[PDB]
Amino acid sequence: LLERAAKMSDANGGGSLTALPVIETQGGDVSAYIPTNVISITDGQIFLEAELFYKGIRPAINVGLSVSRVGSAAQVKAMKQVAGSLKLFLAQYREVAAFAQF
Amino acid sequence: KAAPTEVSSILESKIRGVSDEANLDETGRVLSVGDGIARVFGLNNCQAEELVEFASGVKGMALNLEPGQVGIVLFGSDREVKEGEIVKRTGKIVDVPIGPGMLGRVVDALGNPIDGKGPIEATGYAIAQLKAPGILPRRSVFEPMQTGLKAVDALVPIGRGQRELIIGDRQTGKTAVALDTILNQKRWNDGNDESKKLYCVYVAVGQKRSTVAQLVQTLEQNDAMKYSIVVAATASEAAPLQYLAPFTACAIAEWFRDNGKHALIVYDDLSKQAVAYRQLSLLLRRPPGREAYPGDVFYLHSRLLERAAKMSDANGGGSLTALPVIETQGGDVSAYIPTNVISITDGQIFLEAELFYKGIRPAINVGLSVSRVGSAAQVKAMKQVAGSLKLFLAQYREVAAFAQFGSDLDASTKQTLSRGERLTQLLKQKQYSPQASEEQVPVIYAGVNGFLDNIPIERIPEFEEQFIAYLKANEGDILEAIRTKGELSSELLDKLKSATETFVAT
Amino acid sequence: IKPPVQLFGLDGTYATALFSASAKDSSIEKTFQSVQKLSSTISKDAKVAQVLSNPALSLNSRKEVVSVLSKELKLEPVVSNLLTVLAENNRLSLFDSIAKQFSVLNDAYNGVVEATVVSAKPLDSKILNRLTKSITNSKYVGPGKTLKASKVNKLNKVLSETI
Amino acid sequence: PASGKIRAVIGAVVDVQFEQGELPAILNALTIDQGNNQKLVLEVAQHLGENAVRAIAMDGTEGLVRGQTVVDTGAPISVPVGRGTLGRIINVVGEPIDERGPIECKQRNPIHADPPSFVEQSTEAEVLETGIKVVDLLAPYARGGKIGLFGGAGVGKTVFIQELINNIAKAHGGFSVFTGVGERTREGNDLYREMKETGVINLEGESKVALVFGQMNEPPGARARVALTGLTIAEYFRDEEGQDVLLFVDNIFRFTQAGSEVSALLGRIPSAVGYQPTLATDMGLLQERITTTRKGSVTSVQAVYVPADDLTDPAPATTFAHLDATTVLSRGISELGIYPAVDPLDSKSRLLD
Amino acid sequence: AGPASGKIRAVIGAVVDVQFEQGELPAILNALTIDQGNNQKLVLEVAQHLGENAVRAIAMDGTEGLVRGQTVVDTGAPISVPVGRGTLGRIINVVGEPIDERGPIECKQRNPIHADPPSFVEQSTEAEVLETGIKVVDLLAPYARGGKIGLFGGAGVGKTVFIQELINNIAKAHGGFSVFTGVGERTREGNDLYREMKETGVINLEGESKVALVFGQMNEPPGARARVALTGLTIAEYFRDEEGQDVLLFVDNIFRFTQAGSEVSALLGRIPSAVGYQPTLATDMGLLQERITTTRKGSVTSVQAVYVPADDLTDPAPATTFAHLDATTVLSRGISELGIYPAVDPLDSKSRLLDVSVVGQEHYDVATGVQQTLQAYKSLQDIIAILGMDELSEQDKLTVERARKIQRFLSQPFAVAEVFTGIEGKLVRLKDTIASFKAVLEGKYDHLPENAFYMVGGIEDVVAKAEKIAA
Ligand SMILES: Nc1ncnc2c1ncn2[C@@H]1O[C@H](COP(=O)(O)OP(=O)(O)OP(=O)(O)O)[C@@H](O)[C@H]1O
Ligand SMILES: Nc1ncnc2c1ncn2[C@@H]1O[C@H](COP(=O)(O)OP(=O)(O)O)[C@@H](O)[C@H]1O
Ligand SMILES: Nc1ncnc2c1ncn2[C@@H]1O[C@H](COP(=O)(O)OP(=O)(O)O)[C@@H](O)[C@H]1O
Ligand SMILES: [Mg+2]
Ligand SMILES: [Mg+2]
Do chains D and A meet with 3 or more Cβ pairs nearer than 8 Å? Answer: no
Cα–Cα distances (Å) from C136 to C106, C123, C142, C143, D318, in that order, read 21, 9, 11, 11, 78
State the Rg of chain B over Cα.
27
Length of chain E: 471
For chain B positions 410-469, those within 8 Å of chain E (CB to CB) are 431
Q: List all residues 6 or more positions away from D49 whose beta carbon is below 8 Å from its beta carbon.
A: C55
Q: Which residue type, as a one-letter code, is found at position B142? A: F
State the Rg of chain E over Cα.
25
State the Rg of chain A over Cα.
17
Picking from E186, E218, E333 by the largest number of A CB atoms within 10 A of its own CB, the best residue to mutate is E186
Q: Which of D19, D20, D50 sits opposite C90 (nearest CB)?
A: D50
User: Do the strands D298-300 and B50-53 form a parallel or antiparallel pair, or are they unpaired?
Assistant: unpaired
Tell me which residue of C116, C125, C123 sits closest to C145, measured CA to CA: C116
Tell me which residue of C72, C104, C78 sits closest to C7, measured CA to CA: C104
Distance CA B61, CA B49 (A): 6
CA angle B155, B158, B161 (to 5 degrees): 160
Cα–Cα distances (Å) from B409 to B296, B405, B415, E398, in that order, read 55, 7, 9, 22
Q: What are phi and psi of E323, to 5 degrees?
A: -90, -5
Distance CA B297, CA B262 (A): 29
**Chain B residues within 8 A of D92 when measuring between CB atoms:** none
Distance CA A39, CA E311 (A): 13
Q: Using an 8 Å Cβ cutoff, are B252 and B229 in contact?
A: yes
Q: List all residues 6 or more positions away from E215 whose beta carbon is below 8 Å from its beta carbon.
A: E91, E92, E93, E94, E99, E182, E190
Distance CA B417, CA B399 (A): 8
Q: In what order do the strands lie in the sheet with E211-214?
A: E91-92, E211-214, E178-181, E247-251, E300-304, E148-150, E327-328
The region, left, alpha or beta by phi > 0 then psi within -120 to 50, assigned to residue B372 is: alpha
| Omega before D98 within 30 of 0, i.e. cis | no
Distance from CA of B3 to the nearest CA of E (A): 13
Q: What share of chain A is helix, strand, coil (3-state, %, to 5)?
A: 35, 5, 60
**Chain E residues within 8 A of A38 when measuring between CB atoms:** none
Distance CA E447, CA C43 (A): 104
Q: List all residues 6 or more positions away from B231 whose beta carbon is below 8 Å from its beta carbon.
A: B106, B107, B108, B109, B201, B202, B203, B204, B205, B245, B248, B249, B252
The H-assigned helical ranges of B258-379 are 270-282, 297-305, 337-344
> Is D184 in the active site?
yes
Q: Using an 8 Å Cβ cutoff, are B488 and B482 in contact?
A: yes
For chain B positions 133-172, those within 8 Å of chain D (CB to CB) are 133-136, 138-141, 161-163
Beta-ladder partners of E32? E44, E74
Q: Using an 8 Å Cβ cutoff, are B351 and B362 in contact?
A: yes
Length of chain A: 102
Q: Which helix (H) or strand (E) holds C67?
A: helix C59-70
Cα–Cα distances (Å) from D150 to B334, D302, D348, in that order, read 18, 9, 12
Q: List all residues 6 or more positions away from B123 whose beta carbon is below 8 Å from its beta carbon.
A: B98, B99, B100, B101, B255
D20, C90: Cβ pair inside 8 Å?
A: no
Q: Which residue type, as a one-letter code, is found at position D36? A: N
Q: Using an 8 Å Cβ cutoff, are E172 and E202 in contact?
A: yes
Distance CA B493, CA D289 (A): 61
Q: Using an 8 Å Cβ cutoff, are B175 and B268 in contact?
A: yes
Q: Which of B9, B282, B330 sits opposite E52 (nearest CB)?
A: B9
Q: Which helix (H) or strand (E) holds E436?
A: helix E430-442
| Omega before D166 within 30 of 0, i.e. cis | no
CA angle C139, C143, C148 (to 5 degrees): 120
Distance CA E250, CA E163 (A): 8
Distance from CA of D214 to the nearest CA of B (A): 10
| DSSP letters spanning D272-319 | GGG--S-HHHHHHHHHSSSSB-SS-BEEE------TTS-TTSTTTHHH
Distance CA B333, CA D309 (A): 12
A31 at E interface, C-beta within 8 A: yes
User: Do the strands D146-151 and D176-179 form a parallel or antiparallel pair, or are they unpaired?
Assistant: unpaired
Tell me which residue of D96, D8, D95 sits closest to D57, measured CA to CA: D8
Distance CA E99, CA E216 (A): 10
| DSSP letters spanning D197-258 | TTTSS-SSS---EEEE--BTTS-HHHHHTHHHHHHHHHHHIIIII---EEEEES-SHHHHHH
Q: Using an 8 Å Cβ cutoff, are B59 and E72 in contact?
A: no
Cα–Cα distances (Å) from B217 to B197, B231, C1, E125, in that order, read 22, 15, 62, 8
> What spacing in Å lies between the alpha carbon of B178 and ligand 4's midpoint?
9
Q: Which helix (H) or strand (E) holds B209?
A: helix B209-221
Question: CA torsion E22→E30→E278→E350, rounded to 10°?
Answer: 150
Length of chain C: 163
> What spacing in Å lies between the alpha carbon of B257 and ligand 4's midpoint?
26
Tell me which residue of D216, D262, D209, D215 sits closest to D237, measured CA to CA: D209
Neighbours of C97 (CB within 10 A): 14
Q: What are phi and psi of B486, to 5 degrees?
A: 80, 5
Cα–Cα distances (Å) from E300 to D344, E293, E358, in that order, read 67, 6, 20
Beta-ladder partners of E35? E41
Question: CA torsion D18→D24→D28→D29, rounded to 10°?
Answer: -30
Question: Which sign, positive or negative, has the C-alpha torsion E397, E399, E404, E406?
Answer: positive
> Is B290 in the active site?
no
Helix and strand totals (H; E) in chain C: 7, 0
Beta-ladder partners of E18? E8, E55
CB-based contacts of B414-419 (< 8 A; 24+ apart in sequence): B415/B453, B416/B392, B418/B453, B419/B392, B419/B447, B419/B450, B419/B453
C17, B15: Cβ pair inside 8 Å?
A: yes
Tell me which residue of B464, B452, B465, B467 sits closest to B499, measured CA to CA: B467
Q: Which residue type, as a one-letter code, is found at position B27? A: T
CB-based contacts of E346-350 (< 8 A; 24+ apart in sequence): E346/E136, E346/E140, E346/E370, E346/E371, E346/E374, E346/E407, E346/E410, E347/B353, E347/B357, E347/E371, E347/E374, E347/E375, E349/E140, E349/E141, E350/B170, E350/B171, E350/E141
Is the distance from the beta carbon of residue B272 to the nearest atom of ligand 1 less than 6 Å? Answer: no
E55 three-state secondary structure: strand
Centroid of chain to Cα D293:
20
Q: Which helix (H) or strand (E) holds D343?
A: none
Provide the 8-state DSSP code for C55.
S
Question: Which sign, positive or negative, has the C-alpha torsion D149, D151, D153, D157?
Answer: negative
Distance CA B185, CA B202 (A): 14
Exp. method: cryo-EM
User: Do the strands D176-179 and D209-212 form a parallel or antiparallel pair, or are they unpaired?
Assistant: parallel
> What spacing in Å lies between the alpha carbon of D19 and ligand 3's midpoint?
73
Distance CA B192, CA B194 (A): 6
Q: Which residue type, as a one-letter code, is found at position C21? A: A
Distance CA D353, CA D350 (A): 7
Length of chain D: 353
Q: Using an 8 Å Cβ cutoff, are D252 and D81 in contact?
A: no
E runs forming strands in C52-151: none
Neighbours of B29 (CB within 10 A): 19
User: Do the strands E327-328 and E148-150 form a parallel or antiparallel pair, or are they unpaired?
Assistant: parallel
| DSSP letters spanning B415-472 | HHHHHHHHHHHHT---TT----HHHHHHHHHHHHHTSSSSS-STTHHHHHHHHHHHHT
Distance CA B232, CA B244 (A): 12
User: Do the strands B124-127 and B95-98 form a parallel or antiparallel pair, or are they unpaired?
Assistant: antiparallel
Distance CA A35, CA A49 (A): 14
Q: List all residues 6 or more positions away from E361 whose beta carbon is below 8 Å from its beta carbon.
A: none
Beta-ladder partners of B42? B28
Distance CA E231, CA E114 (A): 8
First to last CA, chain D: 56
Provide the 8-state DSSP code for E424.
P
Length of chain B: 506
Q: Using an 8 Å Cβ cutoff, are E172 and E201 in contact?
A: yes
Distance CA E379, CA B401 (A): 11
Neighbours of E449 (CB within 10 A): 15
Considering only CA atoms, which residue is closest to atom 9 of ligand 3? Answer: E158
HSE-CB at E332 with a 13 A cutoff on CA atoms is 12
Distance CA B368, CA D152 (A): 13
Beta-ladder partners of D76? none
Q: Using an 8 Å Cβ cutoff, are E345 and E157 in contact?
A: no
Burial label, B222 (beta-carbon count in 10 A; 0-12, 13-18, 19+):
exposed
The residue in chain E having the minimum alpha-carbon distance to the alpha carbon of residue B231 is E120
Distance CA D280, CA D287 (A): 11
Centroid of chain to Cα B118:
27
E335 three-state secondary structure: helix
Q: Which helix (H) or strand (E) holds E464?
A: helix E459-469
Tell me which residue of B423, B426, B402 sits closest to B412, measured CA to CA: B402
Provide the 8-state DSSP code for E173.
S
Q: Which residue type, as a one-letter code, is found at position C69? A: L
Q: What are phi and psi of B408, to 5 degrees?
A: -130, 30
D236-260 per-residue burial string, b: 16 or more CB within 10 A, e: under 16: bbbeeeebbbbbbbbbbbbbbbbbb
User: Do the strands E211-214 and E178-181 form a parallel or antiparallel pair, or are they unpaired?
Assistant: parallel
State the Rg of chain D over Cα.
21
Cα–Cα distances (Å) from D83 to A46, D170, D193, D208, in that order, read 79, 17, 21, 9
Distance from CA of B89 to the nearest CA of D (A): 12
Q: List all residues 6 or more positions away from D5 whose beta carbon is below 8 Å from its beta carbon.
A: D16, D17, D67, D68, D69, D70
Q: Using an 8 Å Cβ cutoff, are B295 and D221 in contact?
A: no
Distance CA D75, CA D338 (A): 50
| Omega before E253 within 30 of 0, i.e. cis | yes
| DSSP letters spanning D111-163 | S------SSSS-SSPPEE--S-TTTTTTSPEETTSEEEEEE-TTSSHHHHHHH
Distance CA C133, CA C113 (A): 11
Distance CA D330, CA D345 (A): 10
Distance CA B174, CA B59 (A): 34
Backbone breaks in chain C after residues (C–N over 2.5 Å): 148
Beta-ladder partners of D292? D297
Tell me which residue of B139, B93, B99, B141 sits closest to B120, measured CA to CA: B99
Distance CA D252, CA D146 (A): 11
Q: Which residues line ligand 2 (CB under 6 A)?
A: D 153-159, 339-340
| DSSP letters spanning E129-160 | EE--S-TTTTTTSPEETTSEEE--B-TTSSHH
Considering only CA atoms, which residue is closest to atom 10 of ligand 3? Answer: E158
Q: Which residue type, as a one-letter code, is found at position E181? A: T
Beta-ladder partners of B125? B97
| Omega before A59 within 30 of 0, i.e. cis | yes
Distance CA B274, CA B290 (A): 13
